[PDB]
Amino acid sequence: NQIDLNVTCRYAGVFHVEKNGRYSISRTEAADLCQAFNSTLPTMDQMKLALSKGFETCRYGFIEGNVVIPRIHPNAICAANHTGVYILVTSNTSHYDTYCFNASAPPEEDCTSVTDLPNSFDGPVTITIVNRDGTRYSKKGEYRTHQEDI
Ligand SMILES: Nc1cccc2c1CNCC2
Numbered sequence: 001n002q003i004d005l006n007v008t009c010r011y012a013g014v015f016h017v018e019k020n021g022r023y024s025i026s027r028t029e030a031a032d033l034c035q036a037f038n039s040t041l042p043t044m045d046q047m048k049l050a051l052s053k054g055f056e057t058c059r060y061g062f063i064e065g066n067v068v069i070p071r072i073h074p075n076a077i078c079a080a081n082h083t084g085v086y087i088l089v090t091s092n093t094s095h096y097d098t099y100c101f102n103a104s105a106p107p108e109e110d111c112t113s114v115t116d117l118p119n120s121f122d123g124p125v126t127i128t129i130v131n132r133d134g135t136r137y138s139k140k141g142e143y144r145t146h147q148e149d150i
Pocket residue numbers: 006007008018130131132133
């Protein structure tokens with residue numbers, strides 16, 4: 001009973017979280033996951049500022065009201081060569097990664113590891129934070145509040 005959460009650097013408080021290495025987070029689960037990090041889904045404005053500080057990914061993820069990919073460098077296999085905060089317009093499906101926003105993070109790039117999940121609640125799941133440099137932090141708990149998500 002195990003969940004891996006792959007996390008990025010923070011940029012103006014905004015970071016990306018991927019569950020189990022694949023698109024697998026619903027919009028309800030995304031809000032609960034950010035809440036476990038003492039964070040919220042970013043607004044578009046928060047995401048644009050993060051982009052301006054160096055944030056880019058190649059993965060769709062939730063922000064408050066849209067699903068996006070922040071892009072700095074044009075890449076043909078990431079958001080169809082677009083730059084800026086690329087907004088997903090048309091999709092059949094409902095599960096993506098998430099972005100999260102932590103107001104307590106540093107104002108610019110913070111590429112230190114994440115070593116806690118401060119607002120997880122009691123539960124039976126082994127939750128492992130995996131950083132890009134491989135650094136791991138594990139704890140037993142739960143973050144999902146909606147039964148539809150388990
Ligand atoms: N960001 C991160 C952290 C740990 C593992 C992985 C990522 C990004 N996606 C590939 C795997």
